[PDB]
Amino acid sequence: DMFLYNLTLQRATGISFAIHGNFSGTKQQEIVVSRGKILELLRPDPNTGKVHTLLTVEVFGVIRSLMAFRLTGGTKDYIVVGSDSGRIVILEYQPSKNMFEKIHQETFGKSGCRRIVPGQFLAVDPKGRAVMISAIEKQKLVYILNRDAAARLTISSPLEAHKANTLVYHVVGVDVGFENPMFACLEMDYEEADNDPTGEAAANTQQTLTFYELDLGLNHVVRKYSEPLEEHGNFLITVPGGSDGPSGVLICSENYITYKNFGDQPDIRCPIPRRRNDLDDPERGMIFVCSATHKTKSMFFFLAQTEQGDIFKITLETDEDMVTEIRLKYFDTVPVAAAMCVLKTGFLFVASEFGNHYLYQIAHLGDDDEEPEFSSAMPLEDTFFFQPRPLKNLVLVDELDSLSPILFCQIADLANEDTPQLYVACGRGPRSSLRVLRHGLEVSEMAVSELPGNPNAVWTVRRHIEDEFDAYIIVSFVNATLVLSIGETVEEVTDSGFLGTTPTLSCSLLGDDALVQVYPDGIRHIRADKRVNEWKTPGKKTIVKCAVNQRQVVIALTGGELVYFEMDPSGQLNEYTERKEMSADVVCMSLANVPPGEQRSRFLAVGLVDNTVRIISLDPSDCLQPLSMQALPAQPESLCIVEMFLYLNIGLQNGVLLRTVLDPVTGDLSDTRTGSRPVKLFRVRMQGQEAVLAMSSRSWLSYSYQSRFHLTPLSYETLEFASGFASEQCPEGIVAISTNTLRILALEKLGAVFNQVAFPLQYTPRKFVIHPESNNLIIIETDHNAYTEATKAQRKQQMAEEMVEAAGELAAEMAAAFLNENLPESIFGAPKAGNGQWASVIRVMNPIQGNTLDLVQLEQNEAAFSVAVCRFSNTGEDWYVLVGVAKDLILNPRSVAGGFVYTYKLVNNGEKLEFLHKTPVEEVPAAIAPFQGRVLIGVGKLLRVYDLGKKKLLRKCENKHIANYISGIQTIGHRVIVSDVQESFIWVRYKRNENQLIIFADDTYPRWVTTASLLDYDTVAGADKFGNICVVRLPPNTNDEVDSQKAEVIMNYHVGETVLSLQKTTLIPGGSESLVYTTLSGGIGILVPFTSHEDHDFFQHVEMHLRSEHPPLCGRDHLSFRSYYFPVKNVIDGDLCEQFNSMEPNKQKNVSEELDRTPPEVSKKLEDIRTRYAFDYKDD
Amino acid sequence: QSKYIGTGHADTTKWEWLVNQHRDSYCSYMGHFDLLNYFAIAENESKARVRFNLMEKMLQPCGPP
């Protein structure tokens, strides 16, 4: 038996919908976004300009439409949600409870994203009196919205607006001044097209803009108006009517925009302006992808973005009650957005269709400048032209990191740390990237300055005790120490500091204004009044270790000889009249800070080569006297006494760290392994309290939170030293030095999440492999409708040559500006052209830094879809890089001219690719796998065993009984698992005697596989194009000699987001194996096995209870949702279970008492799963 | 059942069946977000243009009978 448990770690980051309004019922405007399966409420701050996520809720359904409305005289906006349920839901956000309250939910149809069941389209009357939900075809429903005496919104019965054999491109409510509600929509009748064997009825069948009217007095809906359009349009825009502007709709169409208000209003059209000298194929059209609308009591305007990301400001001139002209004007350029929101106080929210999201501030409305303003009345026949310029009307204020779309992922420990990182190949075209993910605390790099030599230490010292900010940063190297004054320019200083040439063991502010340096050859004291008191080391000895304080200085000399200095209130230091020797040498010391009231701290921790730590009193009553010793499992590396009670932290030579309680004696303790690196301990200031920073393979932070400790690692690389920092530039940060680098960092965010570092790419990545020796990455980046750099260059040059042909002699100057400037493709989009064109690039990149080691630009129409790095049995230990490529791939309709397989030498330990040979093949090979000293390559439906030759790759075996097409292949040591594009997995054995691939098993169900992974020698876990995940297992007693084995399915589960990477791995050291998956919406999830049947029954009953006491927000049935395509088999939805903490307390009491438990017990048992398989940073 | 679009009978041609499942498929592409994402990634086109082509395909997904 294998029962699983699903959990989400990083929720989906891509945005499918976005609306704005006063959802909190205040003057503040919020933004409700739909990430597909998750509804989210965000609040952009008009002060700091950051977007904060107020609420995030899993709806357990497919959100297909999102609208907000407001009743007359209302002060708060509701939320209408069209889902994959057969229900419409109206929700209201509650700030006092921070939850969406389901105000209404009315049922009308069946579940699923059906063809004739409404839910796909949603348009509301701009006065809030009625809402219309409609399907893609035929069925359309309208509900009447009216509040009662208690001011609570009430819904009516559905009014039918069906029209058989009619397709709906888009629905939009028309702003009429409190007249009968009007819903305009684009329709297309296919009844004639379905009855004409010539196909002529298919053509000349143009879409009709139709106006539906809701007769409020007669309580029925009638197809009031209908007129055919000139060319097909993609979406509509509500033109504000009534008192503000003229009523009507803006129909967006390929290369045109048409205001077509009905009545005596004449159709007004304007062509879509095109950029000057488009590198795109002129045969391709141009449409708008989205539109925002801003309505003011004074004016109004629109913002319409093109496929290239061109935002235009559309204004309408009006006379009497009719419109005169459509005035477009080039506003700016942002990435291609799925939705835009224009908020008051000047802010534009751009939710990109892929990649990171953006929040800009509107500096200028777009006018008052000297840019050309186009009008519909301008005659031309030819379109308008404009010059794409950098951002001059907007300013980037915030950027939300979104991982969508995640195409490949490898969870491995490529860095020096212990916890594995998530190396994620993800992005969209030119904005693609390889991002490294570490789950910890976000680190804001305030500054980075490289240091010569190898620095080993660093401190930060104030100039006065009353100074709110520090004054000096000291860095100790091998033979020298350096002082920096953190003024306005953080420049190197020499005179104010004195110190010396020799390495420094400590730098502290001893007096109110006196500085003290401890170096191996002695102690230097620097008074504020520049008088230096120098203390030489007695005899030939040197100072091994030290421990400073606000009024105490203890040093440990060779042979373990302690020397104690205490400052008198007059200011000088006085050495004690006795020096104590230890049982062995001293390796580390710590001395607690003095309380504000007292004049000296009592306890002194001293670590010995005895592998023991000892507490020594410093009060004059028992000065330098043993108080309590303690043995340790290894030699200590650092000590740190800290308050919150008193705790002694001990970091050993191995990676173990210990927290102990002490007062007159040492008490009990708890320990944990951090190992791989010796643990160092530093004092840091966090949230106005004292926290401890322990450094090993990772930098962990231990801090108390409401008498409850936390030990959270930093999402950052290895560090070597650190000390607390505080300046006006960074009020509360940390100065840390790593190998040959000095860094000023800050820990602003307190919550632990998946933090990233992004390495930009050029094209959309398909796959990357791990080089075992070099630990580097070989990534293939392939994109459709693209030019390669060479081809782009030839078309730009050729376009200059065509450009000179005009009689004119400014053509050479225009060609100077044009050729000189290659616009950045990351922001202004990448030139796209050709239905058969492609662009593929092989890249060798180091995962430690962002540097690309090698670059291989492929030919024009070559498209790589597979890659691998392996050795060959016939050759030596030389690494080879095979890359599967396709020649002249045309999709829709699928037709391929050829395919290739490049072979590379990968010399200089994985740093450069040397061309070997290029073996051609008939069909595209989208699968390459190392297999028993040779390489399995899947060309088309043919799985072939390939060996290396000096001229070409020799075909050693072939199997052509595969159904459709090979998408991927993975092999255990003996067997071969192949992923058919449509017909699930197949099980093949390779007979070594005859080189024969015998198919010995397949699946009973068809599965549109996307990726998979071998859980063991018998079972395989696979993903689905439709967002499902399954585990299929062979019969237990089987051998590869038998044939036609039906593989039984032991797990089915609909995730709801398309999965593209499954990987069995351990997330943290000491935890258990989990099945981590990534998704196409930028989300990271895990599947977790149960350890006993008792837990299975427990979480299962939790699931059943919450399915009824906490039903999905958008009317969907949870059990049906997870059984979207296949019934659920042995999976418990942990995302639903963790909503136990969000229910009402009475429901928690009922569900808990039904399990004979208490709510806190249920919550802890839910946290146990994350503690065992994910990230838990609680420290008792 | 006759009033439910997509339902079939004994005298239902293969063209009617596959145009029914073709239109159903295109509508499902419109619905499920990540499916439209996969398609918009394969062919380097924005989501809006992919949905537009999927709507133009609704007139005659296969061909005349």
Short mmCIF file of N, CA, C and O in Angstrom, two decimals, chain B residues 1-45:
data_model
loop_
_atom_site.label_atom_id
_atom_site.label_comp_id
_atom_site.label_asym_id
_atom_site.label_seq_id
_atom_site.Cartn_x
_atom_site.Cartn_y
_atom_site.Cartn_z
N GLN B 1 -32.14 15.12 -23.97
CA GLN B 1 -30.78 14.92 -24.46
C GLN B 1 -30.58 15.58 -25.82
O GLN B 1 -29.47 15.99 -26.16
N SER B 2 -31.66 15.66 -26.60
CA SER B 2 -31.58 16.28 -27.91
C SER B 2 -31.23 17.76 -27.82
O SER B 2 -30.54 18.30 -28.69
N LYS B 3 -31.69 18.44 -26.76
CA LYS B 3 -31.43 19.86 -26.58
C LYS B 3 -30.04 20.15 -26.03
O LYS B 3 -29.68 21.32 -25.92
N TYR B 4 -29.27 19.13 -25.67
CA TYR B 4 -27.93 19.32 -25.14
C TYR B 4 -26.93 19.22 -26.29
O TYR B 4 -26.78 18.16 -26.90
N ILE B 5 -26.24 20.33 -26.57
CA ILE B 5 -25.28 20.36 -27.67
C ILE B 5 -24.13 19.40 -27.38
O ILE B 5 -23.61 19.35 -26.26
N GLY B 6 -23.74 18.64 -28.40
CA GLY B 6 -22.71 17.63 -28.27
C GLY B 6 -23.24 16.21 -28.17
O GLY B 6 -22.49 15.27 -28.43
N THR B 7 -24.50 16.05 -27.79
CA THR B 7 -25.13 14.74 -27.77
C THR B 7 -25.25 14.18 -29.18
O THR B 7 -25.37 14.92 -30.16
N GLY B 8 -25.20 12.85 -29.29
CA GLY B 8 -25.25 12.18 -30.57
C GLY B 8 -26.31 11.09 -30.59
O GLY B 8 -26.96 10.81 -29.59
N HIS B 9 -26.45 10.48 -31.77
CA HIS B 9 -27.43 9.44 -32.00
C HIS B 9 -26.85 8.43 -32.99
O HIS B 9 -25.66 8.48 -33.32
N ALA B 10 -27.70 7.53 -33.48
CA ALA B 10 -27.23 6.47 -34.37
C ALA B 10 -26.81 7.02 -35.73
O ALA B 10 -25.80 6.58 -36.30
N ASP B 11 -27.58 7.96 -36.27
CA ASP B 11 -27.28 8.57 -37.56
C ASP B 11 -26.30 9.74 -37.45
O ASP B 11 -26.38 10.69 -38.23
N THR B 12 -25.38 9.69 -36.49
CA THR B 12 -24.40 10.75 -36.30
C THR B 12 -23.14 10.39 -37.08
O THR B 12 -22.55 9.33 -36.87
N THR B 13 -22.73 11.28 -37.99
CA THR B 13 -21.56 11.04 -38.80
C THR B 13 -20.28 11.22 -37.99
O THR B 13 -20.28 11.82 -36.91
N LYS B 14 -19.18 10.69 -38.52
CA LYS B 14 -17.89 10.84 -37.86
C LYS B 14 -17.46 12.30 -37.83
O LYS B 14 -16.84 12.76 -36.85
N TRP B 15 -17.79 13.05 -38.88
CA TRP B 15 -17.46 14.47 -38.92
C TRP B 15 -18.16 15.24 -37.80
O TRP B 15 -17.57 16.13 -37.19
N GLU B 16 -19.43 14.90 -37.53
CA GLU B 16 -20.15 15.56 -36.44
C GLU B 16 -19.52 15.23 -35.09
O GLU B 16 -19.38 16.11 -34.23
N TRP B 17 -19.14 13.96 -34.88
CA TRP B 17 -18.53 13.57 -33.62
C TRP B 17 -17.22 14.31 -33.39
O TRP B 17 -16.98 14.85 -32.31
N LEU B 18 -16.36 14.35 -34.42
CA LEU B 18 -15.04 14.95 -34.22
C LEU B 18 -15.07 16.47 -34.25
O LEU B 18 -14.17 17.10 -33.68
N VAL B 19 -16.08 17.08 -34.88
CA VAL B 19 -16.23 18.53 -34.73
C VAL B 19 -16.78 18.85 -33.34
O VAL B 19 -16.42 19.88 -32.75
N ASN B 20 -17.62 17.97 -32.79
CA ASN B 20 -18.09 18.15 -31.42
C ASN B 20 -16.93 18.08 -30.43
O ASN B 20 -16.76 18.97 -29.60
N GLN B 21 -16.12 17.02 -30.52
CA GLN B 21 -14.99 16.91 -29.60
C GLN B 21 -13.90 17.93 -29.88
O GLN B 21 -13.14 18.27 -28.97
N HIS B 22 -13.81 18.43 -31.12
CA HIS B 22 -12.86 19.50 -31.41
C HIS B 22 -13.29 20.81 -30.74
O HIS B 22 -12.47 21.50 -30.12
N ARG B 23 -14.57 21.17 -30.86
CA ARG B 23 -15.05 22.38 -30.21
C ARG B 23 -14.98 22.25 -28.69
O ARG B 23 -14.59 23.20 -28.00
N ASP B 24 -15.37 21.09 -28.16
CA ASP B 24 -15.20 20.83 -26.73
C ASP B 24 -13.75 21.02 -26.31
O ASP B 24 -13.47 21.66 -25.29
N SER B 25 -12.82 20.48 -27.09
CA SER B 25 -11.40 20.59 -26.76
C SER B 25 -10.95 22.04 -26.75
O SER B 25 -10.25 22.48 -25.83
N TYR B 26 -11.35 22.81 -27.76
CA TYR B 26 -10.95 24.22 -27.82
C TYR B 26 -11.52 25.00 -26.64
O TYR B 26 -10.83 25.84 -26.05
N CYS B 27 -12.77 24.73 -26.27
CA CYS B 27 -13.36 25.39 -25.11
C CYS B 27 -12.61 25.02 -23.84
O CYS B 27 -12.41 25.87 -22.96
N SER B 28 -12.19 23.76 -23.72
CA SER B 28 -11.40 23.36 -22.55
C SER B 28 -10.05 24.06 -22.53
O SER B 28 -9.55 24.42 -21.45
N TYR B 29 -9.45 24.27 -23.70
CA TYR B 29 -8.22 25.06 -23.76
C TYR B 29 -8.47 26.48 -23.28
O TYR B 29 -7.65 27.06 -22.56
N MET B 30 -9.61 27.06 -23.67
CA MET B 30 -9.99 28.38 -23.16
C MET B 30 -10.10 28.36 -21.64
O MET B 30 -9.68 29.31 -20.96
N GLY B 31 -10.67 27.29 -21.08
CA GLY B 31 -10.90 27.22 -19.65
C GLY B 31 -9.66 27.02 -18.80
O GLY B 31 -9.27 27.92 -18.04
N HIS B 32 -9.03 25.85 -18.91
CA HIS B 32 -7.91 25.50 -18.05
C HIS B 32 -6.71 26.40 -18.36
O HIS B 32 -6.18 26.38 -19.47
N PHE B 33 -6.28 27.17 -17.36
CA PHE B 33 -5.28 28.20 -17.57
C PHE B 33 -3.94 27.61 -18.01
O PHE B 33 -3.33 28.08 -18.97
N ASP B 34 -3.48 26.57 -17.31
CA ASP B 34 -2.15 26.04 -17.58
C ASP B 34 -2.07 25.35 -18.94
O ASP B 34 -0.98 25.27 -19.53
N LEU B 35 -3.19 24.85 -19.45
CA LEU B 35 -3.21 24.31 -20.81
C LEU B 35 -2.95 25.40 -21.83
O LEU B 35 -2.07 25.28 -22.69
N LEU B 36 -3.71 26.50 -21.75
CA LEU B 36 -3.47 27.66 -22.60
C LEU B 36 -2.06 28.19 -22.42
O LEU B 36 -1.47 28.72 -23.37
N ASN B 37 -1.49 28.06 -21.22
CA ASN B 37 -0.11 28.48 -21.00
C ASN B 37 0.86 27.60 -21.78
O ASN B 37 1.75 28.10 -22.48
N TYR B 38 0.71 26.28 -21.66
CA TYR B 38 1.55 25.35 -22.41
C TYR B 38 1.48 25.64 -23.90
O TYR B 38 2.52 25.70 -24.59
N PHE B 39 0.27 25.83 -24.43
CA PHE B 39 0.12 26.10 -25.85
C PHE B 39 0.75 27.43 -26.24
O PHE B 39 1.43 27.52 -27.27
N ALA B 40 0.56 28.47 -25.42
CA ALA B 40 1.15 29.77 -25.71
C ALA B 40 2.67 29.76 -25.56
O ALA B 40 3.33 30.67 -26.06
N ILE B 41 3.23 28.76 -24.87
CA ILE B 41 4.67 28.65 -24.78
C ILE B 41 5.23 27.91 -25.98
O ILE B 41 6.25 28.30 -26.55
N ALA B 42 4.56 26.82 -26.39
CA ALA B 42 4.98 26.05 -27.56
C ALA B 42 5.13 26.96 -28.77
O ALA B 42 6.25 27.20 -29.23
N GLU B 43 4.02 27.46 -29.29
CA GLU B 43 4.06 28.50 -30.31
C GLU B 43 4.21 29.85 -29.63
O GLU B 43 3.38 30.24 -28.80
N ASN B 44 5.28 30.57 -29.96
CA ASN B 44 5.63 31.82 -29.28
C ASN B 44 4.59 32.88 -29.63
O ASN B 44 4.80 33.77 -30.45
N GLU B 45 3.43 32.78 -28.97
CA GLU B 45 2.35 33.74 -29.12
C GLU B 45 1.77 34.04 -27.75
O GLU B 45 1.77 33.19 -26.86
#
